[PDB]
Coordinates of C-alpha atoms in Angstrom, one line a residue:
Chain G
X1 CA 80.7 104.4 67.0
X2 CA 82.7 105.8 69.6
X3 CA 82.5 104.0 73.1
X4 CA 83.6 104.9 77.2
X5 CA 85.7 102.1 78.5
X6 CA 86.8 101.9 82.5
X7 CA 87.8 99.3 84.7
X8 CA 86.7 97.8 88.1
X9 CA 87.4 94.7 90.1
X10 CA 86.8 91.5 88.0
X11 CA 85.7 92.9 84.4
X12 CA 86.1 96.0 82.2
X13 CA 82.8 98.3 81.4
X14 CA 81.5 99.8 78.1
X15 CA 79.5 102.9 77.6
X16 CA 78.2 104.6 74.4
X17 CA 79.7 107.9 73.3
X18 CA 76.7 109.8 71.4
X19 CA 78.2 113.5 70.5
X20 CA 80.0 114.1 73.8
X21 CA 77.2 112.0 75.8
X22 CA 77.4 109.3 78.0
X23 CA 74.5 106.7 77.5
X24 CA 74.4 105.6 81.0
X25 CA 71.6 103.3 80.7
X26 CA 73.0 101.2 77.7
X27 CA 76.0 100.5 80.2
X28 CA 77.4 96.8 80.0
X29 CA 79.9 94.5 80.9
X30 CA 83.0 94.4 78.4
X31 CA 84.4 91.8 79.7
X32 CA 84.7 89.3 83.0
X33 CA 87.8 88.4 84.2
X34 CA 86.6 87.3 87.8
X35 CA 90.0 86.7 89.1
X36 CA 91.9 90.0 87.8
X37 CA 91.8 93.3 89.1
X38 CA 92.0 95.6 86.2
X39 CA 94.1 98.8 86.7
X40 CA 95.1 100.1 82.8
X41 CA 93.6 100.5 80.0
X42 CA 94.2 101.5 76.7
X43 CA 92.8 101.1 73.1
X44 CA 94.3 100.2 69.5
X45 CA 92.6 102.4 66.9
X46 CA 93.7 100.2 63.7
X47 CA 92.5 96.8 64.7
X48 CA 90.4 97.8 67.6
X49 CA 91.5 95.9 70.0
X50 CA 91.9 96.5 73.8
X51 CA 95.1 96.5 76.3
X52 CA 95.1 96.1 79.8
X53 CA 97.0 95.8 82.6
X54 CA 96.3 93.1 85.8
X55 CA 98.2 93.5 89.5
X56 CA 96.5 90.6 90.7
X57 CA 98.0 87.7 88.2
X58 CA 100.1 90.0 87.5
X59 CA 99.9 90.5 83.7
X60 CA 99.3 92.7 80.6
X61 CA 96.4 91.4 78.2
X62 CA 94.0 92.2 74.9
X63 CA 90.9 91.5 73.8
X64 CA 89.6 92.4 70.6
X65 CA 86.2 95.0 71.0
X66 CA 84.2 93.0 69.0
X67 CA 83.2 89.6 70.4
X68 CA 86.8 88.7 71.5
X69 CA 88.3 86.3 73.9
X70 CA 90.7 87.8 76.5
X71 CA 94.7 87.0 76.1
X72 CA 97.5 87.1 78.1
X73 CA 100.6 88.7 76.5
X74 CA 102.5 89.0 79.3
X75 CA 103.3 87.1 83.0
X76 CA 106.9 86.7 83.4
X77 CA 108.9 89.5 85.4
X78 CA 106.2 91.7 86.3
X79 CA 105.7 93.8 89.4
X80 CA 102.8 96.3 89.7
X81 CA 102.0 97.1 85.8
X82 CA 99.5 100.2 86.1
X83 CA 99.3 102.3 83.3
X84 CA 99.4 101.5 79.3
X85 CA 99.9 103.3 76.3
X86 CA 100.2 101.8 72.2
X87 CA 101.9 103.1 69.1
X88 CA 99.5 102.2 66.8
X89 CA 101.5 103.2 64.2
X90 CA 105.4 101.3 65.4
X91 CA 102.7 98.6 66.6
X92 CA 104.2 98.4 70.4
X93 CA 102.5 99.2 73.6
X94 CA 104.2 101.1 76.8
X95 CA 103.5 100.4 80.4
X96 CA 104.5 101.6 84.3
X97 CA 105.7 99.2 86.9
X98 CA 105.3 100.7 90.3
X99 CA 106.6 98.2 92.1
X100 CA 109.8 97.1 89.4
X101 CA 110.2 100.5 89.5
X102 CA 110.0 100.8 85.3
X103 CA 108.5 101.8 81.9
X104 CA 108.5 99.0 79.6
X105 CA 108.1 98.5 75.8
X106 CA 107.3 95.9 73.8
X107 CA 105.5 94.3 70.6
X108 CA 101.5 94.0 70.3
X109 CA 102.1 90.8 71.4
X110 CA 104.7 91.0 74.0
X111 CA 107.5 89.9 72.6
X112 CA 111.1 92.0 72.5
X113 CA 110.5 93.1 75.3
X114 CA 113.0 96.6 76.2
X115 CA 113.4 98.5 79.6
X116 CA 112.8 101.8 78.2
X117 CA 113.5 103.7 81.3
X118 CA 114.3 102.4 85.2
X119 CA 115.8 105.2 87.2
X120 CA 114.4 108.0 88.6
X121 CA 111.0 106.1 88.7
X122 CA 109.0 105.3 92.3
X123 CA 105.9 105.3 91.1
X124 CA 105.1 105.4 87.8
X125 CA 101.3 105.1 87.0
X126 CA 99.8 107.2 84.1
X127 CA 100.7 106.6 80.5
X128 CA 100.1 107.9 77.0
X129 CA 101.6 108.4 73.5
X130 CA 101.1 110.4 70.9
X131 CA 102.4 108.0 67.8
X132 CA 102.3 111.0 65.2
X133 CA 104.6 113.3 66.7
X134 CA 106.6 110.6 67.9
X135 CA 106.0 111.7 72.2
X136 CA 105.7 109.7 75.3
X137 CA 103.9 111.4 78.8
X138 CA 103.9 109.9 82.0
X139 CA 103.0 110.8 85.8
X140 CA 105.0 109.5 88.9
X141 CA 103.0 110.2 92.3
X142 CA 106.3 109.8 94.2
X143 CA 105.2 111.2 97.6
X144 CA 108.2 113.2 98.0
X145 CA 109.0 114.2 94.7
X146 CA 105.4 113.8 92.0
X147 CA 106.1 114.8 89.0
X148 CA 104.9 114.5 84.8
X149 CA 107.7 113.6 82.5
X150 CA 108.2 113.6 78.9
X151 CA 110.6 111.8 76.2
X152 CA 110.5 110.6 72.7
X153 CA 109.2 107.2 72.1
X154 CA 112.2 106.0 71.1
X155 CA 113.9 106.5 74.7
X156 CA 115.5 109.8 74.0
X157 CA 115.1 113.5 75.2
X158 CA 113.7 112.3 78.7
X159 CA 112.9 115.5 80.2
X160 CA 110.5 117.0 83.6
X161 CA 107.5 118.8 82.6
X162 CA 105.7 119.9 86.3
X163 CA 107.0 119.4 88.9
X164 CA 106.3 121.6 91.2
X165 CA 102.4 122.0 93.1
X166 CA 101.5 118.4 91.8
X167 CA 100.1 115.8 94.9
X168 CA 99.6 112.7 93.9
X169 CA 99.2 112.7 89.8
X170 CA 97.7 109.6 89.2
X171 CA 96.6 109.8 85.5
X172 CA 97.3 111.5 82.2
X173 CA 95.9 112.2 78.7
X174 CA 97.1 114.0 75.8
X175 CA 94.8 115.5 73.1
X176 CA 96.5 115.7 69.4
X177 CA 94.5 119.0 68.3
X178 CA 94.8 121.2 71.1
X179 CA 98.1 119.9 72.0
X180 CA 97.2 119.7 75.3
X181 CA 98.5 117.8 78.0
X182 CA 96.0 117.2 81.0
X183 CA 96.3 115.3 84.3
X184 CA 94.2 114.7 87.4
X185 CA 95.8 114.9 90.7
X186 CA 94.4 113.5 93.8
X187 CA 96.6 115.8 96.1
X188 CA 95.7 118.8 95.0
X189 CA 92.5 117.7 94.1
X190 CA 92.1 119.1 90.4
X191 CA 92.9 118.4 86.8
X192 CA 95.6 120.6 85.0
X193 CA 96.6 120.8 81.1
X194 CA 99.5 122.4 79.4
X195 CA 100.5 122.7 76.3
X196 CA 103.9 120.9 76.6
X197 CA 105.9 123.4 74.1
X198 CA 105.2 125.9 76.8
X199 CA 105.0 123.8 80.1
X200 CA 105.0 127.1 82.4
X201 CA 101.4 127.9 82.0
X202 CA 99.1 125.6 83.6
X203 CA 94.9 125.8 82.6
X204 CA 93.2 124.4 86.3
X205 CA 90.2 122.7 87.1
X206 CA 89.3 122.7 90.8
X207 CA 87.0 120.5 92.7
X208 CA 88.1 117.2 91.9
X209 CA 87.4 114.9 94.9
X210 CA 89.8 111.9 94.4
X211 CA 90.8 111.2 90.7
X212 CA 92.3 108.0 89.4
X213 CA 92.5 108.0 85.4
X214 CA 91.5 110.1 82.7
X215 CA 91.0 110.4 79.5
X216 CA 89.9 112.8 76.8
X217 CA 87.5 113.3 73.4
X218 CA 88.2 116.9 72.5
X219 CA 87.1 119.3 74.6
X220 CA 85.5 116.9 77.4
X221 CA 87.8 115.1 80.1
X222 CA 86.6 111.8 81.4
X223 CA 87.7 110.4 84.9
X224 CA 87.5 108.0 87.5
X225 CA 87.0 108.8 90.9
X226 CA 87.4 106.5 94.0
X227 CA 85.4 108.9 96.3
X228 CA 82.7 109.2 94.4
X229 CA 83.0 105.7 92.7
X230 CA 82.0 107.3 89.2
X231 CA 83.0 108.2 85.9
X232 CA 83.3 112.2 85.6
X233 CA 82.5 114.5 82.6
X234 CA 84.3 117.7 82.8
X235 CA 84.7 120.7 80.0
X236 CA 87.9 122.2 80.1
X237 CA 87.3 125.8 78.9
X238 CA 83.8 126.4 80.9
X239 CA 85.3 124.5 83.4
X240 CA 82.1 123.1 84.1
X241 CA 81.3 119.3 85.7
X242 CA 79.0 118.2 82.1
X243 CA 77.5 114.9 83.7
X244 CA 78.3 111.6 86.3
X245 CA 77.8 108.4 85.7
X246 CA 77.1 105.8 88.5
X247 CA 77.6 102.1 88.0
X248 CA 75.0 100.0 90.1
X249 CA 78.2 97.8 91.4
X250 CA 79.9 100.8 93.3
X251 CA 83.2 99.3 93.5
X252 CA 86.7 101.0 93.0
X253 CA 86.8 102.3 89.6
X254 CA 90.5 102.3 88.3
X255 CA 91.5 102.8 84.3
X256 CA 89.5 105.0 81.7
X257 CA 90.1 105.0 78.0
X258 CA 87.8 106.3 74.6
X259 CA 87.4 103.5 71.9
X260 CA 87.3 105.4 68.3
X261 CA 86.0 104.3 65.4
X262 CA 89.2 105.6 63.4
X263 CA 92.6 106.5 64.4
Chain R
X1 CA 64.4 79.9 92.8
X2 CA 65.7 83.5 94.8
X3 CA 68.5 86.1 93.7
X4 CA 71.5 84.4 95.3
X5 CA 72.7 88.0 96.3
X6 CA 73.3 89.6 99.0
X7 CA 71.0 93.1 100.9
X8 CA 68.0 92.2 98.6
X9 CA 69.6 93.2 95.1
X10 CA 68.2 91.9 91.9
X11 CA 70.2 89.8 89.6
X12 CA 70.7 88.9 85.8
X13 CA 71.1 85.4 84.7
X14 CA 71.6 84.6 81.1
X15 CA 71.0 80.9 80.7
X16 CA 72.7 80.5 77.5
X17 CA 76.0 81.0 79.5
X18 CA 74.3 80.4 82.4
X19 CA 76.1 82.8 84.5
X20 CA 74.0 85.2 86.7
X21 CA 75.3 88.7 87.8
X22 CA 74.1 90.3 91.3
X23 CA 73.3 94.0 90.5
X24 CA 75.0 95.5 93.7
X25 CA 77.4 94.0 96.0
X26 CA 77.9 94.9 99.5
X27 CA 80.8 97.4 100.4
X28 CA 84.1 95.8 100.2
X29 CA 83.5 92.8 97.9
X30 CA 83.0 92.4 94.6
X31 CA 82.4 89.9 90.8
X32 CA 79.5 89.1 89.5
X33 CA 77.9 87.2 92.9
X34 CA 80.1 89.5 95.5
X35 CA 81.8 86.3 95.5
X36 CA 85.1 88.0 96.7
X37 CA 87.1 91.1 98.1
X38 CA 87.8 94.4 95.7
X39 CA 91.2 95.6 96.0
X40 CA 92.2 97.4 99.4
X41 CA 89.8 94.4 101.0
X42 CA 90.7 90.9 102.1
X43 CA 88.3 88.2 102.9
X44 CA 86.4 85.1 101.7
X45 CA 82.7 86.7 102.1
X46 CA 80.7 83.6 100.6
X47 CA 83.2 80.7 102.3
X48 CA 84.5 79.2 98.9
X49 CA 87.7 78.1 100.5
X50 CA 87.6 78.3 103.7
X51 CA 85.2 79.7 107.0
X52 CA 82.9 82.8 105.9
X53 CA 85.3 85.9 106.2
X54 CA 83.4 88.9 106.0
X55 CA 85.4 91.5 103.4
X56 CA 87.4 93.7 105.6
X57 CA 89.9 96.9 104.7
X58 CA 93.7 95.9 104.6
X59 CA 95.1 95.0 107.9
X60 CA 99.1 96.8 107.8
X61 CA 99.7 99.0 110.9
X62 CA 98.7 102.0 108.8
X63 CA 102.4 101.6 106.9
X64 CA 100.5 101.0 103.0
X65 CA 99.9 104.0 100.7
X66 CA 96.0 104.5 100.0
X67 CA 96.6 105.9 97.0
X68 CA 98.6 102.6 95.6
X69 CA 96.2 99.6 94.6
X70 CA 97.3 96.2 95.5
X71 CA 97.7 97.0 99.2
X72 CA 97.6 93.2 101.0
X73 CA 96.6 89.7 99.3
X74 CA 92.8 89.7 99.2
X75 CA 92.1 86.3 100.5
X76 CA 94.8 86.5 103.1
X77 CA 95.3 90.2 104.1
X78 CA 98.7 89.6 103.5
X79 CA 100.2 93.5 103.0
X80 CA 102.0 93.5 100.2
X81 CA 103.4 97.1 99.4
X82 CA 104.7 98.5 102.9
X83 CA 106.3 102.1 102.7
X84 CA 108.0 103.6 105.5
X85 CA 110.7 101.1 104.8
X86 CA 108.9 98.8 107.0
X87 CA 108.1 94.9 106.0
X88 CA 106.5 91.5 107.4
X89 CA 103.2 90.1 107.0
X90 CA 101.5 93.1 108.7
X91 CA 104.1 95.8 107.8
X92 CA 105.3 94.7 111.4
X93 CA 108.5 94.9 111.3
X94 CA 111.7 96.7 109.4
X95 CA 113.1 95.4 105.9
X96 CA 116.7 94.2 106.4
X97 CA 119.2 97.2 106.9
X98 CA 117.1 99.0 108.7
X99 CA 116.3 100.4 112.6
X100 CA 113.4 101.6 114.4
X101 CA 109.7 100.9 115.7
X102 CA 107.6 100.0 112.5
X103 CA 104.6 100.8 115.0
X104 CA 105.9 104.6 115.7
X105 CA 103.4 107.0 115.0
X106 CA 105.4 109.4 112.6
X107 CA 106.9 107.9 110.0
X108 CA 110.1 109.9 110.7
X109 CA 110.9 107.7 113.6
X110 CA 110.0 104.3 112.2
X111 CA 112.0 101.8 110.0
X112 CA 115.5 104.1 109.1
X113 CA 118.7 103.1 107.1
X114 CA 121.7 101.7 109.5
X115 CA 124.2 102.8 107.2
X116 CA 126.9 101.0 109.0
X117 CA 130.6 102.3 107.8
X118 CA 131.9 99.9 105.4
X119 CA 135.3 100.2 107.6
X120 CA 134.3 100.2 111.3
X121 CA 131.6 97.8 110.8
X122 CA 132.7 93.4 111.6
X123 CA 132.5 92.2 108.5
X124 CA 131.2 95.0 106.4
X125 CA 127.6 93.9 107.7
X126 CA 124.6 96.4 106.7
X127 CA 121.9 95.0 109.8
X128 CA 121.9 96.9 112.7
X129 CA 120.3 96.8 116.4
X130 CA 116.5 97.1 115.9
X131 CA 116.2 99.8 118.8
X132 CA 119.3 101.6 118.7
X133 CA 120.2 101.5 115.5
X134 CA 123.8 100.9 116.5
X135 CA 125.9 99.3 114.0
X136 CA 128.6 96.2 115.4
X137 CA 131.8 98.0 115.6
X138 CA 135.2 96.9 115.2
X139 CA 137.9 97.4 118.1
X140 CA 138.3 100.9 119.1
X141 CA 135.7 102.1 117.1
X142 CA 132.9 103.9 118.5
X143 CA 129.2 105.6 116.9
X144 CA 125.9 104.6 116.2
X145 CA 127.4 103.6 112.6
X146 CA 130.8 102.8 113.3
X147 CA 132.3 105.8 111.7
X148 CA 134.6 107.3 114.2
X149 CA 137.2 106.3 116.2
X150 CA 137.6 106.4 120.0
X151 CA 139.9 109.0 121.1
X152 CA 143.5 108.6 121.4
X153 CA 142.9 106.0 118.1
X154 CA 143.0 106.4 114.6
X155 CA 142.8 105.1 110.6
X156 CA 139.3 103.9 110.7
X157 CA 140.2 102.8 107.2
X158 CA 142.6 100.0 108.3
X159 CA 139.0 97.8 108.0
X160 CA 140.7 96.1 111.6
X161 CA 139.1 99.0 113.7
X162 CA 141.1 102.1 114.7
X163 CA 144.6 101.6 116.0
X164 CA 147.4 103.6 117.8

């Protein structure tokens, strides 16, 4: 019911998600978009239906996960859109703009479009909400100054959450029941989570060779690594590396999202 | 009749769509016959537009970020996100309002701000001199920015250069 979803040059992959396992061999194509290069991705629980984001056009698109033809929702005035994140309840989606130097939001289908934030942003790339509480999270791996933020979804409270012993934090996830707030950093080569009501104390994962995107189903982390062109497994409590997945077409693997079969 | 893929990979073709899919790629290119460049590559490695251009690594003076994606144009090589403050082509040269070598080993000493004094500076320009850095001062005005007067002047804020 529940599927692995990640992103390379030219197309989007899907994976089965049997009780915390990764069906390698049942691995297929998604979805070719020959002329894109995928970066974000992210996934609508109520309609099913998939968003990501393209640097090559550049542009923001859907598709729905069953059967499905790819569409465009947005073009116009885009830089370098990289990360994306939905309300599946307000019905909008969020994105980073590395090179417009932003965090945009707008309607499922990209209309009303609102600069939600545009300052203190250099490069924005990770992404996610948290709809029922109301929360956006988001990682910036300005060279000089990387850091995670927080804010409401509605543009208020925009606050720092780390700042400090963070490289290059290039992706984010949030898990609902733990209220944990993880993050994979290719600087200092490992994945953190707090628990953002009490930021100070940081669980760490070491060993992580160069990290892209993550994302999470419960207790496992998933992520994308460009040195070892595959998708990760990793147990946060153990702390243990559960399994690695390979694609035959080792290309740079970029965004990572879990399709659910409910919200 | 063969796979038309590259280093002896197998392929998929499904003939409904008839589209066929090369299992691996060689390093550097990808889609679904290696037919063109992943990102942080630029190239034409099967000739569709042009001579055959082996896939190659971006091309900018080591003055791009390898953790940012979208480096150069992947048909051109055409750098496309140059830090440092430099610009051009082939990050090759410094974004306007700025000094330096783009080419310098340590990024300290390559493309840096003029910051010309809105006051001492001819006609409030913001370029500079590409080595020295020094900004076009008005009479009596000295500095690498045109913020201090020669001595025996002063009132750098007349905007007509210091006077006595």
């Amino acid at each position: 019911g529940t599927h692995l979803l990640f992103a390379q040059t030219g197309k989007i992959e899907r994976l089965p998600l049997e009780r915390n396992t990764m069906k390698k061999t049942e691995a297929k194509a998604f979805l070719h978009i020959p002329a894109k290069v995928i970066i974000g991705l992210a996934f609508d629980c109520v309609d099913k239906v998939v968003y990501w984001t393209d640097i090559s056009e550049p542009s923001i698109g859907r598709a729905s996960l069953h059967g499905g033809e790819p569409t465009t929702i947005i073009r116009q005035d885009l830089g370098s859109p990289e990360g994306i994140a939905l309300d599946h309840l307000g019905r909008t989606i969020f994105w980073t703009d590395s090179q417009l130097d932003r965090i945009e939001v707008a309607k499922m289908d990209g209309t009303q479009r609102r600069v939600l934030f545009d300052t203190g942003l250099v490069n924005p790339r990770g992404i996610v909400t948290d709809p029922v509480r109301g929360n956006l999270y988001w990682t910036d791996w300005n060279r000089d100054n990387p850091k995670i933020e927080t804010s409401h979804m509605d543009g208020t409270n925009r606050r720092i959450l780390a700042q400090d012993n963070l490289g290059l934090p290039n992706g984010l996830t949030f898990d609902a029941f733990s209220s944990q707030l993880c993050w994979v950093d290719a600087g200092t080569h490992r994945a953190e989570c707090l628990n953002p009501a009490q930021p100070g104390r940081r669980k760490v994962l070491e060993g992580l060779q160069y990290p892209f995107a993550v994302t999470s189903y419960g207790k496992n982390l998933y992520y994308t690594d460009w040195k070892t062109n595959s998708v990760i497994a990793m147990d946060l409590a153990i702390s243990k590396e559960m399994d690695t997945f390979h694609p035959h077409k080792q290309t740079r693997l970029y965004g990572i999202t879990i399709a659910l079969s409910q919200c | 009749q063969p796979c038309p893929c590259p280093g002896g990979s197998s392929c998929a073709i499904v003939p409904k769509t008839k589209e066929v899919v090369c299992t691996h790629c060689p390093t550097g290119t990808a889609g679904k016959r290696c037919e063109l460049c992943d990102d942080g590559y630029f190239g034409d490695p099967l000739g569709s537009n042009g001579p055959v251009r082996l896939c190659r690594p971006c091309q900018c003076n080591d003055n791009i970020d390898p953790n940012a994606v979208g480096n150069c144009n992947r048909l051109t090589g055409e750098c496309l996100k140059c830090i440092y403050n430099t610009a051009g082509f082939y990050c090759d040269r410094c974004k306007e309002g700025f000094f330096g070598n783009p080419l310098a080993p340590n990024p300290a000493d390559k493309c840096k701000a003029c910051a010309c004094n809105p006051y001492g500076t001819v006609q409030q320009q913001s370029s500079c001199n590409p080595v020295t850095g020094q900004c076009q001062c008005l009479p009596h005005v000295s500095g690498r920015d045109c913020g201090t007067c020669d001595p025996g002047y002063y009132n750098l804020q007349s905007g007509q250069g210091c006077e006595r």
